[PDB]
Enzyme design. Structure first.
Site, mmCIF file in Angstrom:
data_model
loop_
_atom_site.group_PDB
_atom_site.id
_atom_site.type_symbol
_atom_site.label_atom_id
_atom_site.label_comp_id
_atom_site.label_asym_id
_atom_site.label_seq_id
_atom_site.Cartn_x
_atom_site.Cartn_y
_atom_site.Cartn_z
ATOM 1 N N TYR A 1 65.335 53.303 59.690
ATOM 2 C CA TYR A 1 64.813 53.433 58.331
ATOM 3 C C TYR A 1 65.781 53.868 57.237
ATOM 4 O O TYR A 1 65.569 53.570 56.060
ATOM 5 C CB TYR A 1 63.597 54.364 58.319
ATOM 6 C CG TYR A 1 62.371 53.713 58.919
ATOM 7 C CD1 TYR A 1 62.252 53.546 60.303
ATOM 8 C CD2 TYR A 1 61.350 53.223 58.104
ATOM 9 C CE1 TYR A 1 61.146 52.903 60.855
ATOM 10 C CE2 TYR A 1 60.238 52.577 58.649
ATOM 11 C CZ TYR A 1 60.144 52.419 60.024
ATOM 12 O OH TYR A 1 59.064 51.762 60.563
ATOM 13 N N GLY B 1 68.452 53.928 54.592
ATOM 14 C CA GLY B 1 69.162 52.935 53.825
ATOM 15 C C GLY B 1 68.459 51.732 53.232
ATOM 16 O O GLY B 1 68.067 51.761 52.059
ATOM 17 N N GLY C 1 66.546 48.234 55.212
ATOM 18 C CA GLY C 1 65.387 47.562 55.782
ATOM 19 C C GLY C 1 64.565 48.313 56.810
ATOM 20 O O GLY C 1 64.366 47.827 57.916
ATOM 21 N N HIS D 1 60.779 58.941 53.306
ATOM 22 C CA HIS D 1 61.327 58.627 51.997
ATOM 23 C C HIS D 1 60.779 57.272 51.562
ATOM 24 O O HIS D 1 60.248 57.130 50.458
ATOM 25 C CB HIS D 1 62.856 58.595 52.078
ATOM 26 C CG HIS D 1 63.532 58.577 50.745
ATOM 27 N ND1 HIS D 1 64.253 57.495 50.292
ATOM 28 C CD2 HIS D 1 63.604 59.515 49.770
ATOM 29 C CE1 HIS D 1 64.742 57.765 49.095
ATOM 30 N NE2 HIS D 1 64.363 58.984 48.756
ATOM 31 N N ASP D 2 60.910 56.280 52.438
ATOM 32 C CA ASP D 2 60.414 54.945 52.156
ATOM 33 C C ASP D 2 58.957 54.991 51.757
ATOM 34 O O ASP D 2 58.560 54.394 50.763
ATOM 35 C CB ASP D 2 60.556 54.060 53.383
ATOM 36 C CG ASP D 2 61.947 53.542 53.549
ATOM 37 O OD1 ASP D 2 62.815 53.958 52.753
ATOM 38 O OD2 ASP D 2 62.173 52.722 54.469
ATOM 39 N N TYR E 1 58.458 56.389 48.237
ATOM 40 C CA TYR E 1 58.779 55.403 47.216
ATOM 41 C C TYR E 1 57.630 54.403 47.113
ATOM 42 O O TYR E 1 57.331 53.908 46.031
ATOM 43 C CB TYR E 1 60.084 54.684 47.581
ATOM 44 C CG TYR E 1 61.353 55.337 47.051
ATOM 45 C CD1 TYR E 1 61.378 56.683 46.709
ATOM 46 C CD2 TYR E 1 62.536 54.610 46.936
ATOM 47 C CE1 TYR E 1 62.547 57.295 46.265
ATOM 48 C CE2 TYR E 1 63.712 55.210 46.495
ATOM 49 C CZ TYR E 1 63.716 56.557 46.166
ATOM 50 O OH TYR E 1 64.890 57.175 45.777
ATOM 51 N N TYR F 1 65.401 60.645 36.519
ATOM 52 C CA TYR F 1 64.641 61.871 36.363
ATOM 53 C C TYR F 1 65.600 62.992 36.004
ATOM 54 O O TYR F 1 66.806 62.768 35.947
ATOM 55 C CB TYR F 1 63.919 62.194 37.674
ATOM 56 C CG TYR F 1 64.768 61.979 38.910
ATOM 57 C CD1 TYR F 1 65.918 62.736 39.136
ATOM 58 C CD2 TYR F 1 64.413 61.025 39.864
ATOM 59 C CE1 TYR F 1 66.691 62.550 40.280
ATOM 60 C CE2 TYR F 1 65.179 60.831 41.017
ATOM 61 C CZ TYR F 1 66.316 61.597 41.220
ATOM 62 O OH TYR F 1 67.073 61.424 42.363
ATOM 63 N N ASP G 1 63.089 62.266 46.425
ATOM 64 C CA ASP G 1 64.517 62.427 46.682
ATOM 65 C C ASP G 1 64.919 63.821 47.145
ATOM 66 O O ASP G 1 65.726 63.968 48.063
ATOM 67 C CB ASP G 1 65.309 62.048 45.434
ATOM 68 C CG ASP G 1 65.363 60.551 45.215
ATOM 69 O OD1 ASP G 1 64.634 59.816 45.906
ATOM 70 O OD2 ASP G 1 66.136 60.108 44.351
#
Lengths: 124, 124, 124, 124, 124, 124, 124, 124, 124, 124, 124, 124
Positions: free
Chosen positions: K28, K30, K32, K48-49, K52, K73, K99
């Protein structure tokens, strides 16, 4: 030839760059179209295609680079009117007439900018 | 079928291997052609293509393997002539003529090594 | 449009899913075909193509989504019978008829389970 | 040649269209043989493939159209049996036997339609 | 390596640019096999592939860039003759011999210009 | 089968995830093959591939999913030693043996991490 | 040629396989790169590209295989020192120098293991 | 424009169809070339490319279709000699000069038919 | 970096969203451009591209993320002016100017909606 | 794992080769997913996919090869009944349960052979 | 934005170049992300993915460049800690936390270089 | 189905050809999602996708062509209002509502011509 057709359009439609308007329009204007024309302009292009198809079979059309794309014919644009002057090479004359009819057909058709670069998957 | 076609060429043109002379010649000889013929020989191939196009739409042509590529007809080559001996099968008789006609057209036409392995991008 | 066409077939051949029986049948059924039809059913699909070909050229057919694939016509299916209701829109009547004619043809012709999911490399 | 192979199949197996029963069966019958045979019939096709592989390395095989697919041999089918009649041309004789042996192997083997139109990703 | 192989051919056949005469000749020259060799020259190339096939199997051949394409060997061309100078490294010797044998085979075999730029589709 | 070969490797080489180390190693380890092995381990995989090629030709090997990838055999890993137990099914026994000698071969070969995901175009 | 270039690097950096350390390094090493060099090593590869760029334009470089990738020059490696021996063939001297200069540069520059197998999408 | 360049070549090299000879020659003649020229003709094309590259940056070259491919300039071909007549549009003049220099460069260079349709993977 | 570039455009051109006006304008504004500019604005973008081209080759530009796309510089926008405040980092100072110059060029140049979303096939 | 799910299917549905029937069925059975299920069986696969999506997010699921495809769990098939036995590893237990309910779901659903290798573009 | 994310990583993890340690780690981290996390760090990236993904459906997020990759931000990094200072713009505040949370998760988690440059086909 | 959806939009927004205004608008209109909706209109489209997502999950939706793209539902447009007439078939009702809700949402939302033919690269 290709450039002569472009110039013929300039003759019937002054002030407007043909490559920058008819190159990729609707379902038939430009390169290899399919389906049904989105308007009158587009049909002019559909008919133009058919004319070229006819030239490729014309008995007099035989020889290297005698194809509609490269074959240079003789014509004149005088006061917005186009005339095909070929007398000897009937292939150049047929081709010239295909372009003439098309350029003149373009001049009597409403041009819609929204049909420019039309998604052709919708042309079926 | 295509093998029969090849042998029809050998009949009217003993001095050549059909697959080296007419496989990639001009714009129409060989796999799928387009544009306009480069010469008389190329035209023979364009006409051939059309004949096959007609063969497919002929009412008498129906069923598996009735296509010009694989449909086996009856014919004869005696002294370089070629005779289509089909009578009951009109489909096979039609395809046979497509091949006999093109084969004789190939022989009754000039050959230009310069057009062999032709750059088809110059066909449009 | 095609979705309507599928339902017309369901109107004429109650006992089957058009997509499972007529989309990969023979050489022409299912669009994207050529060669020689393998049987009566296969001819039906061929004349259906030709029909779509004519629709794309009918003068009455111009405009976004006026093509036979996506043009929605008016029609009805009552008691295994199909009726094209369009009247002043000739284009969308012609297309409705193309599909009507094909659906009745499919129904009258014998279905050859062996020709379903046909090779096609054999259609030459 | 392949067309002759088809007819050899019709000889040992009259009640079948070779192109519909063996052109896409198992993992080896027809075109892209790879993996392990699903059954005895499938094995006949793997052997056939191997035979053709041998045919291309046979010292007697050489020259244009001497490959198993295009090379025409002389053979006979009388009251159900196949006889390879080539003597001088050992290349044809070999190819002919490749075909004869596969044809009889096809007839003497079981046919499983569940294995027709096989998912070759199951061949590994 | 392949670049050395080209030079070995320049050694046994002075005038030709190997890349013009032996890159697309017959069914086997220039890498890419299948089919039946068309003539003696084509045989040479098929034999050359076989040789490379074995090289990839020689116990003596392992390590990065030990393959016949990129493995740089030691050899010499003096007065039109080829000498493989490898001793300490059998792999480099085998490969050098594969190329030597091939270069000498090309030189001895007739060159049929008609087979150059041959269509591989006919190798089946 | 696939998962069994992986476990056989865990039997001969404790402390490694076979799919994490032999997946794309050198030129033959994994899926692809081609060229000359970069070292012994790679050669073990090259030999493995060949053993699998022999199993597909094995008379006993035939039936759906009887290929090396899916064919589940009977084996034992006891104290770092592997034993193939099939007696009834010789195809499963052959496959088991291909995996066994490969796993044992891997264990005798030095593993270079730098050869992981090797650029296979350098393998010629 | 490149194979010679790899050996020049082996001449200047005895302790490594050029293909494992310099073919995917930074933004420019390994050919097919752009952006900003990441370090001294990366600059070496950039000036090596520029060098090849100049070789393709050197007046002295004309003819089949005169390009820096495949042009075989004469050179020697004795006691960690590289010497370009070409004399009257200026083209093949220039290329030999391009590779010589790069190999000595690679050796003088620090090697950053972290920049190996560099992303490149980061070179903008 | 493209056609004008073609005609300029006819001016310097009578009796020979430029599209049918220079369209795809060597490493630079035609469309987007790379590597080193195979001879003098090819270099003429390499230089031609560079000239065009310069025109795209020329201050005076700015505007729709003012690119070398479509920009129609004024020139004359009188007795095998070419003259660029533009005085006002310096972009058309630069372009005209690129073509003139090239056509004249082509006329002083040996033409090798074997370099026609050269495999460009060898151009590195 | 590119986000900073966007904000530089907003500074000199408050009345526009840089990504809708200069993303796909002409032949050079936006991702990779070629051919010759359509106008003054397009030229600004071509020049911008060149500046970035120089930035990459600038000796002061080195290390990860020093490229124009991602390298963050120090600048200021007060009353629509733009001041590059980098002094110690010459690389960042260079890239900053590339962006300040293009940004002011964008504002000091005409905008033609007809060239937005331009057909780049007309750029050659 | 993959092979385990296959065997679970054999447990709930004797007499079938799961890879031969559920490999490419409907719109969700196999590899791909997308659209609306064609029937209950297809829906079972759709639900299966979702269960697998939940396992990848499961806190207990994390480690190399701990994914549904490769993660070997503990289960039992006794008299057509499946039991998941993991207690220590909740990820293997979750995966086992995804496979178990799917296998049982498959067994309650009618299997239509016509849905095999369904044209997934019709799944929208 | 992503560049801000990189700096947040430098904050919690000073001894590392984010783009070299996390831009291609596990399944996960980075680009794809798909499958199951290889470890705790890998899981931080999956979260994180997901974050987002939530960011794009947040009602407060809307308009050009309001996506997690391009939206800027306001945040702070002082003596090792990160503080999201957005109040009015809840879209930025959310992205900022996505983040910040990942950055601290990266630092508080183990790093396994064996999992760097991971073979994602092992993620299934 | 989609063709019906286009007509529902023609119902609530008379003048526009839906295919010209809502096919490439923002990040979500015209199918193909990702990113953050750019405005209210774009929201409508994202909500429309979600709706289709649910439809593919409704227990009531199964069978060939039950997907939202091709599932033909019953509805009516009278005096500018949309009415879903499905009762007996909940799946057709759900989908019809997805399209209705969307058509009414488009009509109510502002149309920002600047966002049409929006570049999806900026949706990250």
């Amino acid at each position: 030839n290709l450039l002569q057709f472009r110039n013929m359009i300039k003759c019937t439609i002054p002030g407007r760059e043909p490559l920058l308007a008819f190159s990729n329009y609707g379902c038939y204007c430009g390169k290899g179209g399919s389906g049904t024309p989105v308007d009158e302009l587009d049909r002019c292009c559909q008919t133009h295609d058919n004319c070229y198809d006819k030239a490729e079979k014309l008995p007099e059309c035989k020889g290297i680079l005698s194809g509609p794309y490269f074959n240079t014919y003789s014509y004149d644009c005088t006061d917005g009117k186009l005339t095909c002057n070929d007398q000897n090479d009937k292939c150049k004359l047929f081709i010239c007439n295909c372009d003439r009819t098309a350029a003149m057909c373009f001049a009597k058709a409403p041009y819609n900018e929204a049909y420019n670069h039309f998604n052709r998957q919708l042309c079926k």
